[PDB]
Amino acid sequence: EDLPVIPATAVERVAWKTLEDIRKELGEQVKASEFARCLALVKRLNSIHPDLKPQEIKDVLDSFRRNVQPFTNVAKPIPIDQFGRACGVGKRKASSARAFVVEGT
Amino acid sequence: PNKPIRLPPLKQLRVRQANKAEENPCIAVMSSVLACWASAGYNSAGCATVENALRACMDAPKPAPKPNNTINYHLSRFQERLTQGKSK
Amino acid sequence: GKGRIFQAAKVYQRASEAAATNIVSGLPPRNPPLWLKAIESIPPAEINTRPYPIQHSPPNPRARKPRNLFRPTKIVYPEDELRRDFYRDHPWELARPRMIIELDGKDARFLDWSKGLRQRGIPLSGESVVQRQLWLMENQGMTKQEAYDKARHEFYKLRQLEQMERRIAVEEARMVGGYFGKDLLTVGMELENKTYESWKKWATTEIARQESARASMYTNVVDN
Amino acid sequence: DEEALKLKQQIEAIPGNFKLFKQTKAQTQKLGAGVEVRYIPEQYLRNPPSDASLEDLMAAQAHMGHNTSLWNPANARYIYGVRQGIHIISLETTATHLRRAARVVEEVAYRGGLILFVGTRPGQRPIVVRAAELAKACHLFTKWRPGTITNREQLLGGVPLTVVDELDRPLSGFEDHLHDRRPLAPDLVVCLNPKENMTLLYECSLAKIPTIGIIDTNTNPSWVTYQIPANDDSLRATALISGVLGRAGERGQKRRLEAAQRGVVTWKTPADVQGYFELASARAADARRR
Amino acid sequence: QHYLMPLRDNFEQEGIRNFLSPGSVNMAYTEYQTFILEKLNALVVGTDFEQKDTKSIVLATARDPELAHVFNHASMAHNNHFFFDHLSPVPVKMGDKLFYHINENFGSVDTLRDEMIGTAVSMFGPGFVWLVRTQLPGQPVALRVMATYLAGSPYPGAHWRRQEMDAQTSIGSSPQGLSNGQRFFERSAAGFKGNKLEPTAPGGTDLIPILCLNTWEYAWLREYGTGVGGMGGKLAYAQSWWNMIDWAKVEEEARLETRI
Amino acid sequence: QEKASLIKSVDWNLLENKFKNLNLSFILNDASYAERNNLSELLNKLYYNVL
RNA sequence: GGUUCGUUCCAUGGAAUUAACGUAAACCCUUGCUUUAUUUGUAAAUAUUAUAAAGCAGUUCACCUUUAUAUAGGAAAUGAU
Ligand SMILES: [Mg+2]
Ligand SMILES: [Mg+2]
Ligand SMILES: [Mg+2]
Ligand SMILES: [Mg+2]
After folding, report:
1. Which residue of C has its CA nearest to D105?
2. Nearest nucleotide by C1' from A97 CA?
3. Is the CB of A82 under 7 A from strand G?
4. Which of D59, D270, D275 comes nearest C105 by C-beta?
5. Burial (CB count within 10 angstroms: exposed 0-12, middle 13-18, buried 19+), residue D222
6. Where does the UniProt annotation place the signal sequence (chain C)?
């Protein structure tokens, strides 16, 4: 506790584990309130200066990191034909339209 | 003048309605409109200013509900300490 | 009779009897709990037995059938009378913050009230005047009023020097280039400003409500 | 943009400033005069006292009873008087009942017993955990789950156990026994707030387990086996009482281990484990036969 | 309570050979420090400072004007002991590293001597002459001389009571007077409003007092007398003091950055 | 643990996420490692081989 | 005692700890996107309707507000989508 601390705005963000993740790995029905006070410690011990931070605190702090990656689903951009006609698609309740838009009058 | 009594043992110390009920402010504006009509006439000019106020009400959006009051939780804590105790 | 029956004061007796013989007759009893031999020679103490409590003041010798015989009595000392007399003549002596938390409880080992008011460990308080007063009133055979004056006057001369140091210390420091922070007087006024402003807002808001109520109270339903 | 980068080289200085600041704190500090520090808030944990004197008990507010009205008349044998509208517990009655309890904690720990320090209050977690470490016992700083003693089969079903020996080291060969064996129960429960958790104490009475509790002026003394009349609402008195009891267990565990290195076991095998012995040879008897 | 601690090398019993008599040090430290501590105890007998060390009291009661009288006894006890904790029975040979740093900041070893001694006499008042080690964020370790009045403190945390120069003989209408006067009001105005004129590094690591010289009259007016005719007095006291400076300790506490 | 849910996270060990471009031409073309163009070598690094 | 579409979740009780069914989840159709396939479907085509296998996606993010600080909620054509 005597080691210095870093301001809350300078500590890089970290995605800590949630109450559900801890309940599963430990196999215990951890209480939400008792876990909230335990997470504050992790946030407190995380603000210690990295260089001055000991090795033990580093490892024990790595077991609380949430290494989850959400699925990426990016839509494909609508290209433009060589002649300049872009094809859009729309549907309404039975239909399927295909509009070819070009610079015109 | 005697002082307040020490409540007997109750099944639960709580207020029936924690949050004050706020009278619809526009039932009061309607009462005024109903007053102009009786004194003067149903179809007159002196009622224009008051009728508009009633129209301004129902066009305005309803305010948001106030946060719930936590009085009943604190009363349950100090029940046995304040009253003679708990029953049942 | 709602409460349950606690037999905690007989765990050794009950547990020892259950280990004397085995359920399966003809066999030797199994080893008893590991605590049976630990409290073998440490029986509980007698509880739930109302004794005659210590009498801190002579009981009424006139009562023919007194009650509350098994009721603890109030602790009263001769100083209680003096404390009340002093702190009433000096009410603002209570505003002086005094610490009652004890460090080790040995503060009474170095209190020799024959020397004077200033002692070791304890601050100069109204208590030092009472103890010094009590000592003179007992050893030197002084009256309650005489000893009160003596110990009381020594208290003033010590309090005066403490108030004179603050003024002379600050003034002396500034003569050599010593600057200080905000004094309690200025800090107190700034807080009153922040609170007064909040009252101005409330009064302004409430004043508006009252005047608005008057407009609605008066009947302007028909404009002619 | 330097205004946003000027916080970095400040962060690069924290290691240097801290190192230089700590060094400076060693030379100049303590130069003026020597202070007679005779009380530190966290002194009952760093180095709790072996025994408690009348001054330690009084300094820790161990004599402050509850209001005169909120009192159990049965426990009036320990009250010294009345002052400030409260009941004053006799300091001499607390010291005597405390030393007697410290003797029970030592003997139970000296005979290989399982102790359980129980303090369930907002700030009683560091106190109970510290005392359990000294005595090599179990701690409990949360609400006691009703049925952990009388219904241990279900509650403490999956919690693992181990088999140790004279010198408290594991013994390989009891794997099959650690699956049919039923859970354990404490041989001595040291409660620091018997008024709050009466479900735990009643189970101990039902289960024939000795108990030690801090009986306040409003607590029923018939709930524990060995009472310690004192103030349980003071977090400073609880640390002293538990500290003394923690040292007792530590002193008891030492004698037990010192007596084991000489081949003198201060306890015989428990009944449950003892039964699994004769059955073990019974299974081996078939090997010799067949 | 605060109790008197023994001195460094048995001075209370024998005193330094060629600097202070055994009876002078007795009246300078044993009889005086005990007197200050006796007064100090009575002031913090029932406060939070009852178990705090002197330095902690020197920094805590620096700006508060109602506790100014407490700062004096605290800083006086610290500055006094700080002066005796740097002497030695026999003169010590200055270190090579320290000897080279002094020349880079003062030109020569004796150039600093005549500066400290000169500042003591020029001050003409009870105070302490400090040899501080100032290091700014990007500046190298540089030394300088600082003089403090009756109970001034060299640490930056107690800048409210540094007491570097007098106001009676340094604030007038002359060009230097107006300048000095402006600084006096600027400090009081900034200190009151809470604004800081000179940024300070966290932990008060800017200034580190290495050496001190107690110019208080109660320490030398007995051994060296008043100094009529220039023989003895305050001047000779400062000169003789230079021979007993524990330059070895002055180098250790300096903590000069390795540069050679 | 039996009744505990399962968080949805991308499993980068799946053969569908490992090689987003499934064509052998892109893969075996010295993408990351050197001189592993042999198709058999690539398969051995993905499946358990008995031979 | 609060909260939630919900015995949902949190806190708490001088008695609780758990199991099964229903609930919930998941499943089928539908909506957006990605990949695969191009005949008997599609004007052309560098591939965009349709057809149908698998996979992803929500109250997620942002904003506002928030009890006992434990659980969260609101806003609904002019934040993203
Ligand atoms: Mg109590
Ligand atoms: Mg329940
Ligand atoms: Mg075809
Ligand atoms: Mg399609």
Report:
1. C38
2. G49
3. yes
4. D59
5. buried
6. none
Q: Which residue type occupies D20? A: L
Considering only CB atoms, which chain E residues are within 8 Å of C179?
160, 187-188, 191-192
CA distance D8 to chain C (A): 32
Place of tokens 């009410």: C91
The candidate with the shortest Cα–Cα distance to A36, out of A53, A17, A50, is: A17
Measure the CA–CA gap between E1 and C125, rounded to whole angstroms: 18
The letter for the amino acid at F3 is K
- C-alpha span between D117 and D102 (Å, rounded): 13
DSSP 8-state assignment for residue E27? I
Please tell me which chains touch F, using 3 or more CB pairs under 8 Å as the contact test. A
The string of DSSP letters for chain D reads -HHHHTTHHHHTTHHHHHHHHHHHHHHSTT-S-EE-----TTHHHHS--SS--HHHHHHTTTTEEEESSS--GGGGGSEEEEETTEEEEPHHHHHHHHHHHHHHHHHHHHTT--EEEE--STT-HHHHHHHHHHHT-EEE-S---TTTTTTHHHHTSS-------TTS---TT-TTHHHHSPPP--SEEEES-TTT-HHHHHHHHHTT--EEE---TTS-GGGSSEE--S-SS-HHHHHHHHHHHHHHHHHHHHHHHHHHTTT--SSPPPHHHHHHHHHHHHHHHHHHH-
Given an 8 Å threshold on Cβ–Cβ distance, is E66 in contact with C184? yes
Pairing between β-strand D188-191 and β-strand D211-213 as defined by DSSP bridges = parallel
For residue E3, the cross-strand partners are D34
* Cα separations in angstroms, B12 against B5, C2, C3: 17, 20, 21
Sign of the torsion formed by the C-alpha atoms of D238, D244, D250 and D253? negative
> Rounded to whole angstroms, how far apart are CA atoms C84 and C144?
13
Which tokens hold the place of D269? 């095998």
Residues 6+ apart with CB under 8 A from F41: none
Q: How far is A39 from chain F (nearest CA, A)?
A: 20
Experimentally determined by: cryo-EM
- Contact across the interface for D110 and C103, Cβ inside 8 Å: no
- Tell me which long-range contacts E106-110 makes (C-beta under 8 A, separation of at least 24): E106/E143
Q: Which residues pair with D188 in a beta bridge?
A: D115
Which nucleotide is closest, CA of A33 to its C1'? G70
Q: How many CA atoms lie within 13 A of A2 on its CB side?
A: 4
Q: Alpha-carbon distance A34 to E124, whole Å?
A: 66
Nearest of C36, A83, F23, E4 to residue D108 by alpha carbon: C36
CB-based contact A69 F10, cutoff 8 Å: yes
In angstroms, rounded to a whole number, what is the distance separating the alpha carbons of residues B55 and C101?
68
Return phi, psi of residue B10, to 5°: -115, 155
Residues 1-40 of A with CB under 7 A from strand G: 29, 31-34, 36-37, 40
| Distance of alpha carbon F47 from alpha carbon E233, whole angstroms | 97
Q: Where are the beta strands (DSSP E) in E136-234?
A: 142-148, 211-214
DSSP conformational letter for D36: -
Sign of the four-CA dihedral D125, D130, D131, D137: positive
Q: Which helix (H) or strand (E) holds D18?
A: helix D14-27
Angstrom distance (rounded) from CA E187 to CA E198: 10
Q: Vertex C26, ends C25 and C32: CA angle to 5°?
A: 70
Least Cα separation, residue E229 to chain D (angstroms): 36
Name the residue among D252, D183, D241 with its Cα closest to residue D212. D241
* Beta bridge partner(s), residue A88: A99
The DSSP 8-state label assigned to residue A50 in this structure reads: T
Question: E126, E217 in Cβ contact below 8 A?
Answer: yes
Query: Which among D39, D114, D205 is the nearest to C104, CB-wise?
Result: D39
